[PDB]
């Protein structure tokens, strides 16, 4: 059962700075089937990145995903005020989907 571990749990940053978020899996993620979601308070999660590096339609270019195997990274090049939220990673490589515990960018 693939455990996803996000780090750090919390990121305190100012607008304009870059946020680098990490998702590390206990096993290799087959086909790099790893996704990132953004969730604001009181709202449903929103897809940002899938297939480790594919940016979903409508997602601004400042979001970018990278990595493979067990080490994955979400990068937000220049934080906007609307980017401060919780971010979850998600592996869908097997029949038991699992999520990271989230990284709060505040």
């Amino acid at each position: 059962d693939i455990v996803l571990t996000q780090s750090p749990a919390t990121l305190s940053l100012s607008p304009g700075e870059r946020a680098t978020l990490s998702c590390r899996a206990s096993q290799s993620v087959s086909s790099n089937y790893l996704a990132w979601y953004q969730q604001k308070p009181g709202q449903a999660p929103r897809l940002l990145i899938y297939d480790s590096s594919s940016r979903a339609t409508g997602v601004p270019a400042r979001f970018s995903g990278s990595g493979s195997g067990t080490d994955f990274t979400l990068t937000i090049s220049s934080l906007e005020p609307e980017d401060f939220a919780v971010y979850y990673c998600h592996q869908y490589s097997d029949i038991s989907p699992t999520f990271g515990q989230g990284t709060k960018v505040e």
Binding site: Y33, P45, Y50, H90, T98
Partner: protein, 118 residues
């Protein structure tokens, strides 16, 4: 392309509840549909998944034997029957379309809060 969720609310421990998710804007008959929940202040957690006729429906260990996922393709509707509810089942429940290599959870329901308390 949307998922219209309904149901939820406040129930007592040991009670029952059924959630609904009505799809439109895509060929629901071919999509794999999942339920995901999020306890207050905690993270996302997969609950159940269902696909085409002849494929296996799957459940998280914490709901196996208590929850039943089902679909009515004629009504483009996804269901989650929640029995033997306990305080740990308190969470916002989301239905979501699973796109796999073509978009993971690319469509989400708005979510409904289920609270189990006495």
């Amino acid at each position: 392309v949307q998922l219209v969720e309904s149901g939820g609310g406040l129930v007592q421990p040991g009670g029952s509840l059924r959630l609904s998710c009505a799809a439109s804007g895509f060929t629901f008959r071919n999509s794999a549909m999942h339920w995901v929940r999020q306890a207050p202040g905690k993270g996302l957690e997969w609950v159940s998944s269902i696909w085409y006729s002849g494929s296996n429906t799957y459940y998280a260990d914490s709901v196996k034997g208590r929850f039943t996922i089902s679909r009515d393709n004629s009504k483009n509707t996804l269901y989650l029957q929640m029995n033997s509810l306990t305080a740990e089942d308190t969470a916002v429940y989301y239905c979501a379309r699973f796109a796999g290599g073509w978009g993971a959870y690319d469509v989400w329901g708005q979510g409904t809060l289920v609270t189990v308390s006495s």
